[PDB]
Amino acid sequence: SKGEELFTGVVPILVELDGDVNGHKFSVRGEGEGDATNGKLTLKFICTTGKLPVPWPTLVTTLVLCFARYPDHMKQHDFFKSAMPEGYVQERTISFKDDGYYKTRAEVKFEGDTLVNRIELKGIDFKEDGNILGHKLEYNFNSSNAYITADKQKNGIKSNFKIRHNVEDGSVQLADHYQQNTPIGDGPVLLPDNHYLSTQNALSKDPNEKRDHMVLLEFVTAAG
């Protein structure tokens, strides 16, 4: 595949999410850009249905791993770009310890020159006064590492990894992630040896933005 050639320079990104957590419905729209040569993502997300009913940090992993920096000698293990432009499906189960869980299904693909991530999310079994629906998580985010493995029978990849969310009382909220990715097209894709993606994260706010929102900077680097 020549999918990697689609990512030179700085590529525009559109993210669309529709969610339902314990019957609280919401939508999020995000826009920004990705620089895969440097593994750098910059995006701003808005809640288009008023107040987001969950904490912004809990949606970071759901809201484009094709922008990871794969070093030149690991180029043969970059499944995510190889599936482009037709793209891939990305599915997760995210289990919050002592609380509920998210189920997500997304399609990541090019629409013209824009890389688009379109997601449906359903949240189940949350406590109304827990850390999520009670908005008890700090507005920040930790660095993390995720182990990527091949799923040869599905012509895709899978991953299990942990995310830790700081809580306002000084405790930590664990979010266990299960992930599977499968290509949308029927063309050839790259199936990788096992390796790591390393993510660095910085969350902020736009001082002139009245809407409920999240500004995100990310660096993502492959290093098996």
Side-chain angles (χ1 to χ4, degrees), residues 1-128 130-151 153-209 211-224:
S1 169
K2 329 285 303 309
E4 61 291 344
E5 306 184 352
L6 296 167
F7 287 90
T8 66
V10 174
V11 169
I13 299 167
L14 168 67
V15 180
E16 298 188 316
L17 180 145
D18 295 316
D20 177 330
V21 175
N22 279 31
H24 307 287
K25 294 175 191 286
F26 61 95
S27 291
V28 171
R29 182 183 177 88
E31 292 137 325
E33 65 188 52
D35 179 357
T37 296
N38 294 305
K40 179 174 181 181
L41 286 160
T42 52
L43 290 106
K44 172 175 166 184
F45 303 91
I46 300 291
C47 180
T48 62
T49 52
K51 167 91 203 68
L52 192 69
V54 298
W56 281 107
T58 69
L59 303 178
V60 168
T61 57
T62 298
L63 295 165
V64 288
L65 300 169
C66 47
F67 289 103
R69 180 180 86 90
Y70 274 77
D72 201 286
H73 59 278
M74 257 171 299
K75 245 50 166 162
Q76 64 272 43
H77 309 292
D78 189 351
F79 163 87
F80 307 106
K81 295 185 189 58
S82 76
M84 296 297 164
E86 290 175 293
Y88 52 80
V89 176
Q90 176 163 300
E91 288 166 335
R92 292 211 185 90
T93 302
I94 301 176
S95 302
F96 295 89
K97 187 173 179 176
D98 300 319
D99 212 329
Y101 55 101
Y102 294 162
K103 295 290 280 207
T104 69
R105 181 187 182 278
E107 295 185 0
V108 186
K109 65 178 171 290
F110 274 93
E111 294 174 12
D113 277 343
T114 298
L115 193 280
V116 181
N117 178 25
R118 199 163 285 115
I119 317 133
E120 291 173 310
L121 173 155
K122 192 162 168 70
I124 316 94
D125 289 342
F126 283 87
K127 301 166 171 170
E128 278 289 332
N131 288 331
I132 288 81
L133 291 179
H135 292 281
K136 309 184 189 193
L137 299 182
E138 294 294 357
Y139 185 78
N140 53 33
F141 213 89
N142 297 305
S143 303
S144 73
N145 272 10
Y147 198 57
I148 309 306
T149 72
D151 189 349
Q153 202 272 345
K154 295 179 200 56
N155 212 29
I157 61 94
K158 56 184 195 309
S159 180
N160 281 279
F161 60 96
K162 292 177 177 279
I163 298 294
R164 283 98 172 181
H165 298 294
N166 293 2
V167 191
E168 69 190 11
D169 67 352
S171 67
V172 173
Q173 170 73 64
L174 173 62
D176 284 312
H177 283 62
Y178 166 80
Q179 183 181 329
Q180 52 183 52
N181 293 57
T182 59
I184 289 175
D186 285 314
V189 295
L190 295 177
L191 299 179
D193 292 335
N194 297 358
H195 64 283
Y196 276 97
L197 298 179
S198 174
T199 310
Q200 299 156 301
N201 297 287
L203 272 49
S204 61
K205 298 285 193 189
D206 177 355
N208 302 318
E209 181 54 72
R211 304 165 287 183
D212 199 0
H213 74 282
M214 171 177 66
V215 178
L216 173 62
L217 164 69
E218 279 199 342
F219 294 98
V220 188
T221 310

